Design a protein around this ligand. Sequence first.
Ligand code: HEM
Ligand SMILES: C=C1C[C@@H]2[C@H](CC[C@]3(C)C(=O)CC[C@@H]23)[C@@]2(C)C=CC(=O)C=C12
Length: 452
Amino acid sequence: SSIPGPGYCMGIGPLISHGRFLWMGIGSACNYYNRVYGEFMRVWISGEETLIISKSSSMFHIMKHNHYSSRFGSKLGLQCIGMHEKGIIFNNNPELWKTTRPFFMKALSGPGLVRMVTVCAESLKTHLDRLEEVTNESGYVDVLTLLRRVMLDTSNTLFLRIPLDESAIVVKIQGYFDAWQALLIKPDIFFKISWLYKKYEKSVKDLKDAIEVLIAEKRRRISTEEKLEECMDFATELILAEKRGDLTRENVNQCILEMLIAAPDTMSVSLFFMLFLIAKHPNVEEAIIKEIQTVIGERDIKIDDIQKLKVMENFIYESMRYQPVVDLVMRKALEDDVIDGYPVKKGTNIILNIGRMHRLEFFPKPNEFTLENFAKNVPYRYFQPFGFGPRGCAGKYIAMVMMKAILVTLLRRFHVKTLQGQCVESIQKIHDLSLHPDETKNMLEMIFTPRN
Ligand code: HEM
Ligand SMILES: C=C1C[C@@H]2[C@H](CC[C@]3(C)C(=O)CC[C@@H]23)[C@@]2(C)C=CC(=O)C=C12
């Protein structure tokens, strides 16, 4: 098998496709190219050949083997946002990534994943007793903002615990995201003409400078302190590693930033799409309340409860399957290989189109939202909402805990209504790095009406 895809127009092949990506958006460009050509095909972002793949078989191969534990993207765009060989998310240096990930992995599982289930519920309870902060005169709640705030609160009180300006940092975090999303695949030419990008350069500084203030304090409280053994957390772990010789201060700093943004960047959008799905699916929402009555009653949500919330678990999966937020994964080939039928040279960029994959394969009723798609145990090789393997989502387990926790704590207390005939299908969406709602539009509010 030779490689499918558009004609290489003697050096015009690349230019049309890279342009198509910038004009369309990374997400909807992938969906376009996969629809036109095969579920496996070649394109050019910048110079380098890049493959876009929805085939579950290829998907599985890639996330499984160790020679795909890299991502890709403009070096100058990454340097701009500070993820060039520094975080983990888009840290593309094999060795430096290898040595940092452990820290993330430890903090996002075991003892911490148990605190998180209650840290979440409390954080949300706080914010639900302060609805005045997010509710309109006509009772319209800004769900997106509320969520982002409890996500940041949650992340902070678990991984860093330093008092911060919640409202302020959330807006800056979004500046950071947008900037990241903008510069990720902008061709080098773009960075030469400075008044075009320096817009973004400023949102990055706004967040980084806001965070240096926080880590500066965490550094003090550590260098004083009585029983240091008593209270280990993500930020401390890193700082002490730096205090040995394991980490650079710059890197530490990026990781803390990367940990704080991660939840607000994804959970909030995901739960938002989940909340709309509940409103327009009354049948499903009844099953979820019964399960809560059966499993929890009027007791505080605890770790031992989460396995029992079976219906909800399926709801979360079906929501992510049907309305994904992270619908694509970027990887790079580190060794040569043959993947399915095709030769894949090292240095080849890969975009796994997991969103399209969850509609072309396995599932009984792919194109409608039903809890029937998850009535029979799903092979983790046909459904990858987080990815798996050496570089799968580091939060994949804690994530599910948090989502379960916040949904329970919310639906426990309020019925949710969507304005007009609005639903996830009829929301206007941007489809670039992630797949999220266009916030320059409106009608994205909800109404929270009490229960009992
Ligand atoms: C429901 C929300 C979430 C979704 C849909 C999601 C999904 C994903 C996916 C698909 C990847 C790419 C993995 C791969 O390449 O196969 C990823 C990576 C990652 N995720 Fe998540 N995730 C979520 C929540 C979180 C949370 C809460 C955190 C941390 C608090 C987190 C931290 C990370 C990090 C640090 C990476 C980069 C991993 C690496 O390259 O080493 N994620 N996530
Ligand atoms: C929404 C996104 C986009 C995700 C990214 C991890 C790497 C992903 C999956 C890619 O290869 C392309 C889109 C990227 C993620 C989940 C990780 C952390 C975060 O803060 C925000 C994220």
